[PDB]
Curated annotation (Swiss-Prot):
Assembly description: Binds constitutively to TP53BP1. Binds CDC27, which is itself a component of the anaphase promoting complex (APC). Binds PIAS1.
Subcellular location: Nucleus
Swiss-Prot/TrEMBL induction comment: During mitosis. The mRNA encoding this protein contains an internal ribosome entry site (IRES) in its 5'-UTR. This 5'-UTR generally suppresses translation while specifically promoting expression during mitosis, when cap-dependent translation may be impaired.
Signal sequence coordinates: none
Superkingdom of the source species: Eukaryota
Native organism taxonomy: Eukaryota, Metazoa, Chordata, Craniata, Vertebrata
Protein name: DNA cross-link repair 1A protein
Gene: DCLRE1A
Tissue specificity remark: Expressed in brain, heart, kidney, liver, pancreas, placenta and skeletal muscle.
Family, per entry: Belongs to the DNA repair metallo-beta-lactamase (DRMBL) family.
Length: 341
C-alpha cells in the first residue's frame, strides 16, 4: 500500500506514487522527475491529473505516451494554484526537469518535498528564503558521513583533460560513456565539446535527449555513429566483454577504447582524491569509474537542513531498515543541537 512518506497531509496529494493503483482519496498525483523508481506505473492508460515540470511533461508524452489532457506542466519559481492549494516548483539540481515542491496548506503549514536533489548554496536564495518550512520530506540517499565527493565541476575537469590527452596522443582511440536514465549529460557533452565531435547514440536515447530543452542540442548529438568519436551505450555494456564487442562493430576505424562509468558513490572516495583516480585496463581497453553524483553529499545535505531549520524531517530514502532509520534520526538530532533550532 502507499507509504505515508508519499502522502501530503491536509491535501488530496501524493508524490511519486504511481505503482499502488488508485490511491484512495488522491485528487492530484505529482511527479518530481523522470526516473523509473519514481514514475513506475505511468502509461497511456493513466487517467488522473499529473502535475510536473515542462521537461518531465515532455518525457511523459513522448516516452510513455501519457495523454496530453492529463499532463499539467507548471513553470518553475512561480506561485500556482492546484485543487485550491498554493504550490511552487523549484529546481532540484538532480537530472533535467527534476523539481522540489513547496506546499502552502490552507491551515498555514508549509511543506517542502525535495524529490531527489543535490543540495546547493544557490537554493538559500530561491523562494525558500521568503518563509518558514514546518515539515521537510528529505532525499536521504547519502545520509552518512562516509559519503564525501568532489564537485561536479572537478569531476568534469578530470574527464575532459583525460579524454583530450588520450585522443590527442592516439587519434584512433574511441571514447565511450555509459548511461541508464536521464541525468549526468554533462559528462558526455563536455567530452564531445573538447574533442570537436558530436555524441553518437541509439535512436531511443536521441529521442529522450530531444525532450530536454537543452540549448544547441542538435549541434551536440546524433544517431550517426560512424561520424562520431564519442559513443553512448547502456551502463550494462561498460565492461571488458561489452566493449571488446562494440570495438569489433566499428570495423577497424578505432584501435583503443577509453570508457567512463559515472557511478554514484564508490568506497575509493574515502581514500582517493579526484586527481588520484586510475582506470582498470585490459589490452587496449581502459575503464574509468568517476564519482559524478546528482545527490547531496552528507555535508551538503547537513548545510541545507541547518539553513532551513525545519520543525520535523521525514526521510524518503533508506527507510526500509531499522538500523538505517535510527541512524538517520540520530544525525538529524545532532544537526539540530549543533545549530540551535
Ligand atoms: Ni532520481
Amino acid at each position: 500500500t502507499c507509504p505515508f512518506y508519499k502522502k501530503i497531509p491536509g491535501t488530496g496529494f501524493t508524490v511519486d506514487a504511481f505503482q499502488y493503483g488508485v490511491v484512495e482519496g488522491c485528487t492530484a498525483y505529482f511527479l518530481t522527475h523522470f526516473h523509473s523508481d519514481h514514475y513506475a506505473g505511468l502509461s497511456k492508460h493513466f487517467t488522473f491529473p499529473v502535475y510536473c515540470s515542462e521537461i518531465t511533461g515532455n518525457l511523459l508524452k513522448n516516452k510513455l505516451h501519457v495523454q496530453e489532457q492529463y499532463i499539467h506542466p507548471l513553470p518553475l519559481d512561480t506561485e500556482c494554484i492546484v485543487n485550491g492549494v498554493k504550490v511552487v516548483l523549484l529546481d532540484a539540481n538532480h537530472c533535467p526537469g527534476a523539481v522540489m515542491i513547496l506546499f502552502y496548506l490552507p491551515n498555514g503549514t508549509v511543506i517542502l518535498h525535495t524529490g531527489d536533489f543535490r543540495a546547493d548554496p544557490s537554493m538559500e536564495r530561491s523562494l525558500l528564503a521568503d518563509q518558514k518550512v514546518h515539515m521537510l520530506y528529505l532525499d536521504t540517499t547519502y545520509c552518512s558521513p562516509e559519503y564525501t565527493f568532489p564537485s561536479q565541476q572537478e569531476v568534469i575537469r578530470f574527464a575532459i583533460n583525460t579524454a583530450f590527452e588520450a585522443v590527442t596522443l592516439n587519434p584512433h582511440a574511441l571514447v565511450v560513456c555509459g548511461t541508464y536514465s536521464i541525468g549526468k549529460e554533462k559528462v558526455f557533452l563536455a567530452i564531445a565539446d573538447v574533442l570537436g565531435s558530436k555524441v553518437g547514440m541509439s535512436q531511443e536515447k536521441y529521442k529522450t535527449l530531444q525532450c530536454l530543452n537543452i540549448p544547441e542540442i542538435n549541434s551536440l548529438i546524433t544517431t550517426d555513429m560512424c561520424s562520431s568519436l564519442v559513443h553512448l551505450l547502456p551502463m550494462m555494456q561498460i565492461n571488458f566483454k561489452g566493449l571488446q564487442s562494440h570495438l569489433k562493430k566499428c570495423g577497424g576505424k578505432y584501435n583503443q577504447i577509453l570508457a567512463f562509468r559515472p557511478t554514484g558513490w564508490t568506497h575509493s572516495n574515502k581514500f582517493t582524491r579526484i586527481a588520484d583516480v586510475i582506470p582498470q585496463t585490459k589490452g587496449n581497453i581502459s575503464i574509468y569509474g568517476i564519482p559524478y553524483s546528482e545527490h547531496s553529499s552528507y555535508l551538503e545535505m547537513k548545510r541545507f537542513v541547518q539553513w532551513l531549520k525545519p520543525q520535523k524531517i521525514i526521510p524518503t530514502v533508506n527507510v526500509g531498515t531499522w538500523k538505517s532509520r535510527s541512524t538517520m534520526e540520530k544525525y538529524f538530532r545532532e544537526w539540530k543541537l549543533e545549530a540551535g533550532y
